[PDB]
Symmetry: D2
Subunit: 123 residues, 4 copies
Amino acid sequence: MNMIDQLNITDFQVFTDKIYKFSSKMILSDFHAQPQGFLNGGASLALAEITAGMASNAIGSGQYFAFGQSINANHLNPKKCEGFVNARGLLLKNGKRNHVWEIKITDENETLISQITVVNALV
Amino acid sequence: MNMIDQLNITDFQVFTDENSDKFVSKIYKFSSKMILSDFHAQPQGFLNGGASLALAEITAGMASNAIGSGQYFAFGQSINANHLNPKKCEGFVNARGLLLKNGKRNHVWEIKITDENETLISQITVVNALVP
Amino acid sequence: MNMIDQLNITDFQVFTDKIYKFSSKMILSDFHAQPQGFLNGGASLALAEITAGMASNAIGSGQYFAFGQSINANHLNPKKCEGFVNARGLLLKNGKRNHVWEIKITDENETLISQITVVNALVPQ
Amino acid sequence: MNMIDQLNITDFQVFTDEKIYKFSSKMILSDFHAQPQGFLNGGASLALAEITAGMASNAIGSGQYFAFGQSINANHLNPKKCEGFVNARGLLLKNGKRNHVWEIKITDENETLISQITVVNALVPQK
């Protein structure tokens, strides 16, 4: 089994609220934990790049594949590696060559854990 | 087998240059490799960027902790990456770091992810928070 | 007149909902123009760092001054060097030594021009 | 005078090294560049990076395309007093057909790293 699958990303949905948006959950196990007992930042980065790629491809509907070009993240608050996080996305730019996703990672109390921007290349 | 271990980070070493010996501001670097399998793949058969991002944050954290040694523990605060060239998900990549700032509260690492031919795959900057 | 003055930032206010937000305007003229006639992205970068710093300083009430630590910007759409842009911020993190500002720069049609995140170090004064 | 001119960017040059593209430049400081505590305004350094990256990209594609800053990432590592000059040196990490990625180092008179900034330029035909 690969990394994407073991991340356990659930309830992924891409929807126009045109303003494109996505939402998803990540169920947290030992897989996601760093040594100190918190959610690994690398897991959160992976979640954002993947779900942004998934969301861009679903908008294209056959016309192009999404390929991460750049990513920026700020880890704001520590999340103890338990339960789940929500990754919610907003499409800032719906361009010809690029997609720019603003992504918020929140816990079950809606505390912002990470803010992440993903630029996808459209190939 | 958590994500960290499944990443298969190999040959990790943190070091200073021999030149920095008699200077006050030591130049810190790290080296490592990541051995690729399907675990690291994205849908089109290339190295997934999430794996490279995770490699950068994890090795930077390991390097920071090694430099501090008991003094502090390092926590990922910030990460910026630019994916320059595609890497087919096979063989291995190198992750090499240069410490741009050895601050009291933050470490800033400049990290180059390179393929086996030294072609730059991803350029990544990691800011670590330093905890007592 | 320094760069800050000549950037012509008007209507700056920081307001609470604590959720801290700010809004402001940058009035465009020849000062802000790049050679093709567009708003210079460098002017927008500057606008974001300065207003984030202005907003943190207003929160600090003299106890500290904000120093720009890291900035991440995406220039999204072109803006012709005329009229004005809005700079609106949201405090993502109200930390004891750092503030993290999410700043959206939009034209007068609320078309998003640039999105910028700014981390300020909070240094005791 | 506009912002670009008042920034006072001097000694600008683009060159190749051991096909690796690089640029070199200076910015001489007055109180134009200052923030309220007497330090170099980070915003001036940001603008320096975007401008020089744009100038350097345009000097390479002269004039197939125009360079336009797409994304910029900056870490301001060390404060500088707003006096003297800074050096801005860029390295082309990726010479794409559609994008350039410049790694830019802002250092002081003695080559102490003040800010490290990465500029991604969009390469758009003209026409």
